[PDB]
A paper describes a structure:
Unlike SETD3 or METTL18, which methylates a unique substrate, METTL9 specifically recognizes an xHxH motif (H is for histidine and x denotes small residues.) and catalyzes the methylation of the second histidine. xHxH, as a known metal binding motif, is found in a wide range of metal binding proteins, suggesting the potential role of METTL9-dependent histidine methylation in mediating the metal binding capacities for those proteins. Based on the predicted METTL9 structure from AlphaFold11, we chose to mutate its surface-exposed hydrophobic residues to stabilize the protein. One METTL9 fragment (METTL946–318) with six mutations, named METTL9M6 afterwards, exhibited high solubility and homogeneity. In all METTL9M6 complexes, H1 and H-2 are snugly positioned into histidine-specific pockets, while x-1 forms hydrogen bond or hydrophobic interactions with METTL9M6 and x-3 stacks with the aromatic ring of METTL9M6 Tyr306.
To understand the selectivity of METTL9 toward residues at the −1 position, we further solved the structure of METTL9M6 with the SLC39A5 mutant S374A (S-1A) at a resolution of 2.75 Å with the mutant peptide well resolved. In the structure, Ala374 (“A-1”) forms hydrophobic interactions with Met126 and Cys297 of METTL9M6, with a distance of 3.8 Å between Ala374 and the main chain carbonyl group of METTL9M6 Gly124. Any residue at the −1 position larger than Ser or Ala is disfavored because of potential steric clash with the main chain of Gly124.
Author numbering:
A (entry chain B): 55 to 198, 202 to 318
B (entry chain A): 54 to 318
C (entry chain D): -3 to 2
D (entry chain C): -3 to 3
The structure:
Amino acid sequence: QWYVCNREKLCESLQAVFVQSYLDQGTQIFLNNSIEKSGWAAIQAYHSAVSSAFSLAMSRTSINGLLGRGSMFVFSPDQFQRLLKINPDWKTHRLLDLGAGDGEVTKIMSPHFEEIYATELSETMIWQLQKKKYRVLGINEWQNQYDVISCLNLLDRCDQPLTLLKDIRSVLEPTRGRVILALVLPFHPYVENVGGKWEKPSEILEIKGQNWEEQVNSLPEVFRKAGFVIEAFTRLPYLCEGDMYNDYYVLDDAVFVLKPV
Amino acid sequence: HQWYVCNREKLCESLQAVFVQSYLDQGTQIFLNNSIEKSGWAAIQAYHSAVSSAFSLAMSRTSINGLLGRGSMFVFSPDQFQRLLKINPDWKTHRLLDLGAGDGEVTKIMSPHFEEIYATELSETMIWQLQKKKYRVLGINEWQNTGFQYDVISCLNLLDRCDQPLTLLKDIRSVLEPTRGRVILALVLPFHPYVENVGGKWEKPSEILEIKGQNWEEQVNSLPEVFRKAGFVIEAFTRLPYLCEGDMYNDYYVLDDAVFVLKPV
Amino acid sequence: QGHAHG
Amino acid sequence: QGHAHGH
Ligand SMILES: Nc1ncnc2c1ncn2[C@@H]1O[C@H](CSCC[C@H](N)C(=O)O)[C@@H](O)[C@H]1O
Ligand SMILES: Nc1ncnc2c1ncn2[C@@H]1O[C@H](CSCC[C@H](N)C(=O)O)[C@@H](O)[C@H]1O
């Protein structure tokens, strides 16, 4: 199963605030729609065609964001609000989704915030983030106050992760404002580039272990090196729209809710 | 030809002494002869206009041309370049920096005079083609803080396409090698700047230049007082045709380029 | 092709 | 189309 974690191997700090997640409704919508689109033969062939012709002149991310394809799923609205421990009509002023992809994972968060900001490298992904009427900021413009800051599967796709986490604490509202973070495990970071080639990150984030279990036990050491404690955390399937050979694609996530301490 | 000729009499006293006549040489002719050949490729041009049209909304036309490798451009030939910076065909120094390098074929002319080549570029597909040529692409706001100066800083046909051209000029001066360093600078005239967006939208620039006049000889005279303000004087300059590959309608396209060599003041 | 993230 | 420098 995608949701079980060996609780016995977890460190007691994390056992205390481990939220248990499951294949809820919202996850099923996504899976269903990922099976529906992976039946549209004409679409699945035009995605296959565009990407293969342009694969050596754009990054996959940019190609995925040119077609509106490869949309991904992290948490249902219900899952999201339970992790945060809030009400379905709860609301605040500012969200920030850093490296937001196509905004679909940002959409599921949007009804809880009045204003929405996001950053991104891919300029076709900036386009779709702007098609949703979000406010886009530069990679270094958002660190000049945000009520919630989102950093979902970016710490393994960016060059300066520790700077990011210290930058996040810089502009996060302190009294109540929380951050939500996701991280594919086992850890394997790289800086994607055009043509499938990639750069290695500049800063190194120390993730001990060979397993989801031991690896998350190494992150409390890290979240306070930038100024956060884990208020809650769960395990989710990092779902992605399939193609023509598979109806969807899964990866092993770990999502955290963080307070400034 | 009518591309390289200006009424020198309508140039100011400062600029009448630094003008360098250019000529339609054998290197500009190789380019037209390829442009013409590429327009002749019926299947390729239709394919270019088929792609360029589909994705007109998601991407800027700069990155679409860079997606397809089409739309390469031309400012000077090896011989013309060497005749403006006044250097041998075997001249050589350490470091070049091409700001807003585009697709790289204009940098590829300057290239063999430097053993290190740096470029900045706002477009993700251009940046790849720049990397394709083994060029070290820097951050748009990262070339100023490298830790090393630049022997020649190239800035061709960008001041009418960027957001803060004055901050740019002052930036070039701050990191340019002070003793023997020069900048080579290209401007299209009639000066008409705008900042490119996606889908055809175009914001205006956050800084205004005073490149104003009724002809080529008039706007060029506006530039000594401009260049003076950012710490440069014009060591030489010339009139060159800004040229670009064609599509199905015209074998090539021609804009009116002023090229300068500026020395730190 | 496959996952958009990896 | 036209010139790649833009319009
Ligand atoms: N330094 C950086 N700043 C902002 N975005 C970045 C970045 N480095 C990489 N990215 C973007 O981060 C994305 C990683 S995939 C994650 C996207 C989305 N948050 C999700 O969870 O599905 C890529 O789209 C990439 O374009
Ligand atoms: N602010 C900026 N910083 C870096 N590059 C920029 C920029 N604004 C525009 N550019 C790039 O500069 C180019 C201007 S068109 C000029 C292309 C090329 N330098 C030539 O002389 O032919 C475009 O490709 C655009 O992407």
